[PDB]
Write a protein that binds this ligand. Sequence first.
Ligand SMILES: N=C(N)c1ccc(O)cc1
Length: 338
Amino acid sequence: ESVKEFLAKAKEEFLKKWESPSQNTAQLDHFDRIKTLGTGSFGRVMLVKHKETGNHYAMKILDKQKVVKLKQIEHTLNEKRILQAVNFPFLVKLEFSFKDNSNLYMVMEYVPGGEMFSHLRRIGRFSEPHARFYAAQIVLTFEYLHSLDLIYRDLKPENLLIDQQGYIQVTDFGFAKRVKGRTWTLCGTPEYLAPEIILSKGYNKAVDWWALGVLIYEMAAGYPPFFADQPIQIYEKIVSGKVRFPSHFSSDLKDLLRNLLQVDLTKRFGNLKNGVNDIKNHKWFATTDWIAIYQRKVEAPFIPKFKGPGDTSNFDDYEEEEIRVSINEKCGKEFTEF
Ligand SMILES: N=C(N)c1ccc(O)cc1
């Protein structure tokens, strides 16, 4: 009943914001640009500083014309509408959003510890306790998102930032969607795609549980379970129903992963009648205090090294390009609801 009532309140609060989204809550010249933190085919993320408060933020800037060209309109509207409505300890907070003649802007909390990906690659692999600490946070986050009828669809180490307490903050809702039943879009990252996405089926939240299996494997091994030089070769491995485990994996870890990396979605943990409880009650999680994780009372495996809220040492270096705003409005109609 405790979990039922928690998730019922969570859904009520989400739906109120979902139905009446916030809009136009800052503007670009309220911020100073500090550094580019990441780049993609239609946008970038920039460390900015608010000129009046001095607070640092990560500002995601999407070029409207590129969003249209790369057929990402609905996805960008999903991302903003979802992010402004969610509230969970392991989800990055959206603080402002706005648009101008050229771009869409989402201003989010800045997490100076950087991406899990960097730390994983620096250390090689995480011990099982360390992987389990992060995995537990993802399990709770997916329990929350799925109870709101949301599918995340982009779980991977680059989208999980490590905060000042060593806890995860999930970023990048670009593929997240509110789904009743099935959805069909081909999206994600090749190594993390569930078989039913590769096979062009209508799929559901089970794809997030598959991706959790991939993430746990990668955290504990140092490399993902399905790897190859070309995506088609990765996809052949994903659909095959075969996975090999390093000998150092515990038996409990192997068993959990066989049930998350189950090619038959109707047999996959997280998608059975007992839902998330098949995962939470698995022996690999026997040492996990779920409430203590949620309350952020567990001491983390490591605290990232950084000097202060504006330090960018844990992020890498990108060419610094202009944020140009056209004199003329672009794509106004397509982005009316943003
Ligand atoms: N670097 C960050 N703190 C960050 C990155 C991406 C994002 O979508 C949100 C926040």
